[PDB]
Amino acid sequence: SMNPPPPETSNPNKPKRQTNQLQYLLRVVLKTLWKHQFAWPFQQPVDAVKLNLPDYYKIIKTPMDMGTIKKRLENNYYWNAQECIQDFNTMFTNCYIYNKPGDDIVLMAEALEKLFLQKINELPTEE
Ligand SMILES: CC[C@@H]1C(=O)N(C)c2cnc(Nc3ccc(C(=O)N[C@H]4CC[C@H](N5CCN(CC6CC6)CC5)CC4)cc3OC)nc2N1C(C)C
C-alpha cells in the first residue's frame, strides 16, 4: 500500500483572516509543542510505507500531524481557532486509537496533550 496524500494545507476558495487566537495558536501553542522532547513523531504525517505499517491508514482515516497544522496556520487555512484545536485533538486521538494505552508513543502524546491543554487554557480573548 501507498501512503495517502497528506492533508490539504491551503485552499484559495476559503475566506481567510488573522485573529489574535489563531496568532496565539501558532506563536505559542504550536511553538511550545514543536520544541518539546517528544514532538518529533508528531511533526509530520505518518509515513506508513517507511515505517512498514500497512494497517495504519486502514484504521486512521482522519490523519493529522503538527507539520500539517503549522502549514495550515501559516497559510490562514483556519477561520476559527476551534478548527485548529480540533486538528490537535484529532492528532492525539489518532495516536490513542492505533496504539495500546501505556505504549511509548502514547506516553509521548500524553505529555504533549497536557502542555497543549495548559496553553489552550491561556488562550486570549475573542477579538
Ligand atoms: C505510526 C504509529 C505510531 C504513531 O501513532 N505515530 C504518531 C508515529 C509517528 N511517527 C513514528 N515514527 C517516526 C517518526 C519520524 C521519524 C523521522 O525519521 N523523523 C525525521 C524527519 C526528518 C527530520 N528533519 C531534520 C531536519 N531537517 C531540515 C532542517 C535542517 C534544516 C528536516 C528533516 C529528522 C527526523 C521516524 C520515525 O520512526 C522511525 N512512529 C509512530 N508510531 C509507531 C511506529 C509506534
What's the 124 CA to ligand 1 centre distance in angstroms? 32
Decide: 97 in ligand 1 pocket, CB within 6 A: no
- The residue contributing the CA closest to ligand 1 atom 5 is 95
Q: How was this structure determined?
A: X-ray
- Residue 91, phi-psi category: left (phi > 0), alpha (psi -120 to 50), beta (remainder): alpha
For residue 22, give the C-alpha cell.
489563531
User: To what resolution in angstroms was this structure determined?
Assistant: 1.8
* CA 24 to ligand 1 centroid distance, Å: 25
19-123 — its CATH code?
1.20.920.10
- Give the three cell numbers for residue 32: 511550545
Q: Give just the sign of the alpha carbon dihedral 41, 45, 51, 57.
A: positive
Q: How far is the CA of 73 from the centre of ligand 1 (A)?
A: 21
3-class DSSP assignment, residue 54:
coil
Amino acid (one-letter) located at 117:
L
